[PDB]
Amino acid sequence: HGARIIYDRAFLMACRKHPLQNRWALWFFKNDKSKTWQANLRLISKFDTVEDFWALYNHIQLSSNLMPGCDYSLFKDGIEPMWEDEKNKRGGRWLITLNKQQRRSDLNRFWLETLLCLIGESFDDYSDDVCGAVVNVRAKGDKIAIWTTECENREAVTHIGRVYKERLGLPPKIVIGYQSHADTATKSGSTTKNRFVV
Amino acid sequence: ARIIYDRAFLMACRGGGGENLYFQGKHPLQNRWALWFFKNDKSKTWQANLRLISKFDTVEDFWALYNHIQLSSNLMPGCDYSLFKDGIEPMWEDEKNKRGGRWLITLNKQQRRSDLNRFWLETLLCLIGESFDDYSDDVCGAVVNVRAKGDKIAIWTTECENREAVTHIGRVYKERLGLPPKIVIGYQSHADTATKSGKNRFVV
Ligand SMILES: Oc1cccc(-c2ccccc2)c1
Ligand SMILES: Oc1cccc(-c2ccccc2)c1
């Protein structure tokens, strides 16, 4: 009693009410410059059970989901999906970049696997370091990221990265980078440096 | 058997500093509970303004959260705190609230300093302590609305038509608040509260 509520992938998929450890908020953003950033960022919904997750997931999937210049974000209740939030400003993200061909084959499965890591508390005590996840749907290639709260907590960040990579099913040859938000916020060429790789 | 704690027991577990030896030293609750907060920030939608603070399922974890948090008396008007059983949202259109209602007490502006904190704590101890015997299963949660015109504390129950459960909870709640017989609490269905018409099914 006082124990973390943890669900594995098989359990979550069998529910497709069971309470979640955290309440989560789904956000939607399109950078439309005729409107201000507060108008463009929309809270879609909040949930705190497995069944309510699945009802929301099924409904968004039936709405031409993952639109072609939009971002979707799932964050713990009380964290805005912007790096300047108190819970994100000292943090960073594990980033998965998908090439054009992978929009057809991997984007849908990889976004779902990320969401199940978050809601299922798959990183043991290091799940407390997770803030949320973001998918950026773009013509040049889609990006999926897990955002974490403290870019100097090496042991939390690397455990999250390695469990995440395992849950995505990526081969050991494919390496993924963690970028500090402070480094991503400064545009310095084609790429941002990786604080860590796994 | 139902896990029931009286007021004296809960109050003895407070500020304890007990060694939770073997993770078996805490006193389990019958239910897991979630504390919610609603902020008055009208620039955001009400959905963005409802936040889950924390969940707990032992007496000692209740007290650690209670001790940490800001008191109701100190909330800016327009804020709400709610304690609900895990899996029930503190909104009337939740499946577990839509056919139910609440026992409501309203406090005047001066009772904020004298009675609001004490009534809110006594309500929380009724909930976590399962003080309504088998009828505790009809309890969804409790809400405190801090407002300029006068504060409101309510116990929400799941089913209007369970007359005996609703009336027993009302009578026990009034006793635990210490209200004189002359001051009454009223029960209103959520469906009736939701319609502004100018509505107590029961009073005790
Ligand atoms: O098909 C989609 C596309 C974008 C977001 C989601 C989603 C639904 C519920 C919770 C979290 C994310 C589903
Ligand atoms: O001082 C307060 C103010 C508002 C809520 C609470 C609370 C704390 C723990 C469980 C339930 C309610 C305490």
Numbering used by the authors:
A (entry chain B): 9 to 24, 36 to 217
B (entry chain A): 11 to 208, 212 to 217
Report text from the authors:
Eukaryotic initiation factor 4E (eIF4E) serves as a regulatory hub for oncogene-driven protein synthesis and is considered a promising anticancer target. The eIF4F complex includes a core of eIF4E, eIF4G and eIF4A5,6. eIF4E recognises and binds the mRNA 5’cap, and recruits eIF4G to provide a scaffold function for the eIF4F complex, while eIF4A is an RNA helicase that is stimulated by binding to eIF4E and eIF4G8. Here we screen a fragment library against eIF4E and identify a ligand-binding site with previously unknown function.
